[PDB]
Design a protein around this ligand. Structure first.
Ligand code: HEM
Ligand code: HEM
Ligand code: HEM
Lengths: 67, 75, 378, 60, 241, 96
């Protein structure tokens, strides 16, 4: 039962507009690749964009509280 | 070679000069200073700037085309 | 009479930097000669102290360098002043060759050619310099480049193995480079003295390209102090790098000890060669690329025969001013390209900048000159 | 008091390249120190990331 | 695989120009090295004495070195014993031959942490983000449950397990040790291992700017004063007739 | 080194192959033993210097790679030291 500032901050950050759209495009592709078989368009890219938008905002807010 | 006294021939030209301990080192430094620099900039922008923005445009484009060429949609 | 004038030693000094008639005219672009001199002794001075500790065997190559920055007192500023001094040296070098081209200073055949030799020399000097700490980039940059000579017909092989001291970039190859990187700056300095000897025959050129015999001033106190101030600026630049952004111009990859089987994906030479690297790979030929890369620097020696204007300086010629900066910009493109992977846009744009560089020098500037003459009824 | 300052400074210490030098060397002494105080004091004020750590871990 | 994502810019307390390192944060980071990485990561260029002026005290430093057995020189029999560990000792640890890293893991070399921050691209930022941004595979690619997944890593797929939440701990005056708060520290320590001079130079840098901020104008005025004579010279041409 | 000098190529190999060396590490970070090539030197007796000492009593039997050039009187001194071995005169006892 620990305090994980990363997870606390990730939640509110992972929410925001930019991230929704990328997570949206992610799930879109997720299911696209899930509902196909013998496909190789492998859904890696959409994850990264989501991380960028998320992690950029993760940096601005994080350390501010970190002890 | 070289040396003063043997450089070249000159006649009829007077030169008035002043001891540095008598004048100021920065007369109207900003007063006349800035106007001049603008003037010099103006005098040269059209010759210096254009190739640089041309590079700049080719730089940002070339960069975008690189990044956007490494993703795929259909096919 | 006056000792400064007649003592067999001082005469030199006096006629070199005290009484020497100089144009009242010369501007900041003329400071680079003295800064190049300062860069030289600085590389010699810090470089020496670095050699009192650096050991030249693969086993301790990297290690000794680390030993320097951590254990050796202030070995770190020394190490960084050295590294950054090399870059400062190239900035001034390129600025110097810039001033010469813009202002027509190259009409001094001998002075200028000695300068081309100064260029290749400081260049050859620095290529070897960076192989020393035996970093990934060192070994690899050392491998990529050396091999280039393997394109020379019937002899490239034998030659490359000969300067290698084996069949690869081995132990022989590191000590060798240490030795040459030590002796080259001394020869540089003597050749720079002949640069000055020949330069002193005519005196300096000036911004207008018009003869200034009619308005000469003594080098001291004017250009001793204008030279002092501009050295302080070079110290600012230099110190800003070592004391704030020491690795900014350096690859992080050279901080990883060499490994002959590894081979990084990244693989580029030091910033001061990128333009030439670009030009080289823009050609899908072993011999072509290398030949073209050579022609890329050795063309500084073609410049005087391509002079076409009835005026020496470019100060009063706008078609040429435009072409000049296009040349600068085109090198900046070449730098940029050379720092990028050989893929997508970059290939063809890199091949364009190449042809351009050559068109701009070998044809566009000479032609602009003829037109500017025609426009003046000359 | 103001003109006579630069003046007296010239009078008693500047003509003779002797004193002129005697002063810059003597002036370099005091300066080197006073600069290192203020400079370090400045480096400290913008930081306080080491040294007051000592008051904690030891004192024996 | 052949596509990548670059680290964000975390507001380190030494990212600033004239900004010293947090030494309290270098300790925690050291501790992070001693238990976790020290069994997989070499740090050959740092020694126990190096820590003295930095974090710990003289005595503190000794005891830390004395908690391992080294291998001092041979004696009379041409031997090799083992020793408590001095101060002159470095941190050469894990495996003897390189391949012993390999055999232990599967190929895979856990590169030495003496020079990491300076040797990746993105300093502490890349390491911190690789340590912290550990995540789960999207789709269409399976690893080998050996080659764990990482977005902040070239090929997004490679080798190291996330030992960053597995929590150890020992902060004398105490601090919670989350994944993140333990990462800043190993990174804040990894900077200093790659550049122990960090703080000293920035002090000189401050002096360098202060000095140059005094010398520069001063030399200018000196040069202005001597050129005075040429700047104000007036010409007149008086030809005959 | 012996090849162009005394023996032949093949002869030289076999002579080296009559000892077990210690070639490089492999995969496990190990150290095995090898027949001996040609690239091998003659590093033999004792590892640490003092192992010469422990074996004998102090006393280092100096390397013979440079002996003739390192004594004074070349082969003459070594030859005479080897050959002129003799019995103690009087008044001094050794330590056998
Ligand atoms: C080892 C590096 C070099 C050093 C130390 C060096 C030194 C100097 C010095 C002290 C001057 C005095 C006047 C001035 O700077 O304008 C000068 C001028 C000149 N240098 Fe260099 N130089 C070097 C490289 C070059 C290069 C690479 C070139 C061109 C290939 C070059 C060609 C010239 C020319 C033509 C001038 C005459 C400038 C004028 O009067 O406008 N030198 N150099
Ligand atoms: C004869 C005086 C010189 C000596 C004794 C010298 C010796 C050394 C030594 C021992 C190293 C390896 C240690 C280290 O990297 O810090 C080195 C690095 C280097 N020096 Fe020199 N060198 C001298 C002149 C030069 C010159 C003329 C240049 C060209 C500007 C130069 C540019 C370099 C470069 C590029 C490196 C490798 C990059 C690095 O610093 O990591 N040095 N030098
Ligand atoms: C806080 C302690 C540790 C830190 C800071 C650390 C940090 C790192 C870093 C920065 C790299 C290189 C990343 C890159 O190549 O870009 C790395 C590589 C690696 N380390 Fe760790 N690590 C730590 C503990 C471990 C542990 C416990 C293991 C054992 C699972 C481990 C095994 C590896 C391996 C196998 C690699 C190679 C990855 C690969 O190339 O496939 N390290 N580590």
């Amino acid at each position: 039962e620990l305090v994980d500032p990363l997870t606390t901050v990730r939640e509110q950050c992972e929410q925001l507009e930019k991230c929704v759209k990328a997570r949206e495009r992610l799930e879109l592709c997720d299911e696209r690749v899930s509902s196909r078989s013998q496909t190789e368009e492998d859904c890696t890219e959409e994850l990264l964009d989501f991380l960028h938008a998320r992690d950029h905002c993760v940096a601005h807010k994080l350390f501010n509280s970190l002890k | 070679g070289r040396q003063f006294g043997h450089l070249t021939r000159v006649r009829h030209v007077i030169t008035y000069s002043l001891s540095p301990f008598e004048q100021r080192a920065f007369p109207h430094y900003f007063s006349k200073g800035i106007p001049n620099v603008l003037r010099r900039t103006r005098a040269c922008i059209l010759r210096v700037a254009p190739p640089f923005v041309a590079f700049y445009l080719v730089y940002t484009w070339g960069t975008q085309e690189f990044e956007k060429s490494k993703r795929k949609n259909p096919a | 009479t006056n000792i400064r004038k007649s003592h067999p030693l001082m005469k030199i000094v006096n006629n070199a930097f005290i009484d020497l008639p100089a144009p009242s005219n010369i501007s900041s672009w003329w400071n680079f000669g003295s800064l190049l001199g300062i860069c030289l002794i600085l590389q010699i001075l810090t470089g020496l102290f670095l050699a009192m500790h650096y050991t030249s065997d693969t086993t301790t190559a990297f290690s000794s360098v680390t030993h320097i920055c951590r254990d050796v007192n202030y070995g770190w500023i020394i190490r960084y002043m050295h590294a950054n001094g090399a870059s400062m040296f190239f900035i001034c070098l390129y600025m110097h060759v810039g001033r010469g081209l813009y202002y027509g200073s190259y009409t001094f055949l001998e002075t200028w050619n000695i300068g081309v030799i100064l260029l290749l020399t400081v260049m050859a000097t620095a290529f070897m310099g960076y192989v020393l700490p035996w970093g990934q980039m060192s070994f690899w940059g050392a491998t990529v480049i050396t091999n280039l000579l393997s394109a020379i017909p019937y002899i490239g092989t034998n030659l490359v193995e000969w300067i290698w001291g084996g069949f690869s970039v081995d132990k022989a190859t590191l000590t060798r480079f240490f030795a040459f990187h030590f002796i080259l700056p001394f020869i540089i300095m003597a050749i720079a003295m002949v640069h000055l000897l020949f330069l002193h025959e005519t005196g300096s050129n000036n911004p207008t390209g018009i003869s200034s015999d009619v308005d000469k001033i003594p080098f001291h106190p004017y250009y001793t102090i204008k030279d002092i101030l501009g050295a302080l600026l070079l110290i600012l630049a230099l110190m800003l790098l070592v004391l704030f952004a020491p690795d900014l111009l350096g690859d992080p990859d050279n901080y990883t000890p060499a490994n002959p089987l590894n081979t990084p994906p990244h693989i580029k030479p030091e910033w001061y060669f990128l333009f030439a690297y670009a030009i080289l790979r823009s050609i899908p030929n072993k011999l072509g690329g290398v030949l073209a890369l050579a022609f890329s620097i050795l063309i500084l020696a073609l410049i005087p025969l391509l002079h076409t204007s009835k005026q020496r300086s470019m100060m009063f010629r706008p078609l040429s001013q435009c072409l000049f900066w296009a040349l600068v910009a085109d090198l900046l493109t070449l730098t940029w390209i050379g720092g990028q992977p050989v893929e997508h846009p970059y290939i063809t744009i890199g091949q364009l900048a190449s042809v351009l560089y050559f068109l701009l020098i070998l044809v566009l500037m000479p032609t602009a000159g003829t037109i500017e003459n025609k426009l003046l009824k000359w | 008091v103001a003109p006579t300052l630069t003046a007296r400074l010239y009078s008693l210490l500047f003509r003779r390249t002797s004193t002129f030098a005697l002063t810059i060397v003597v002036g370099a002494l005091f300066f080197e120190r006073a600069f290192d105080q203020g400079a370090d004091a400045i480096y400290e004020h913008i930081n306080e990331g080491k040294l007051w750590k000592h008051i904690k871990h030891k004192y024996e | 695989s052949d596509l990548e994502l670059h680290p964000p810019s975390y507001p380190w307390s030494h990212r600033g120009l004239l900004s010293s390192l947090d030494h309290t944060s270098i300790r925690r980071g050291f501790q992070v090295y001693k238990q976790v990485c020290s069994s997989c990561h070499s740090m050959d260029y740092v020694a126990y004495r190096h820590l003295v002026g930095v974090c710990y005290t003289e005595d503190e430093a000794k005891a830390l070195a004395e908690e391992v057995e080294v291998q001092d020189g041979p004696n009379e029999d041409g031997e090799m014993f083992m020793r408590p560990g001095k101060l002159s000792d470095y941190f050469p640890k894990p495996y003897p031959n390189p391949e012993a890293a390999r055999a232990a893991n599967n190929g895979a070399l856990p590169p030495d942490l003496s020079y990491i921050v300076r040797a990746r691209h993105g300093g502490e930022d890349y390491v911190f983000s690789l340590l912290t941004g550990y995540c789960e595979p999207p789709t269409g690619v399976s690893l080998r449950e050996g080659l764990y997944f990482n977005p902040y890593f070239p090929g997004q797929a490679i080798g190291m397990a996330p030992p960053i939440y597995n929590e150890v701990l020992e902060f004398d005056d105490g601090t919670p040790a989350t994944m993140s708060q333990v990462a800043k520290d190993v990174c804040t320590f990894l900077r200093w291992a790659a550049e122990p001079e960090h703080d000293h130079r920035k002090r000189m840098g401050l002096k360098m700017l202060l000095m140059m901020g005094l010398l520069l104008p001063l030399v200018y005025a000196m040069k202005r004063h001597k050129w005075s004579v040429l700047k104000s010279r007036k010409l007149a041409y008086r030809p005959p007739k």
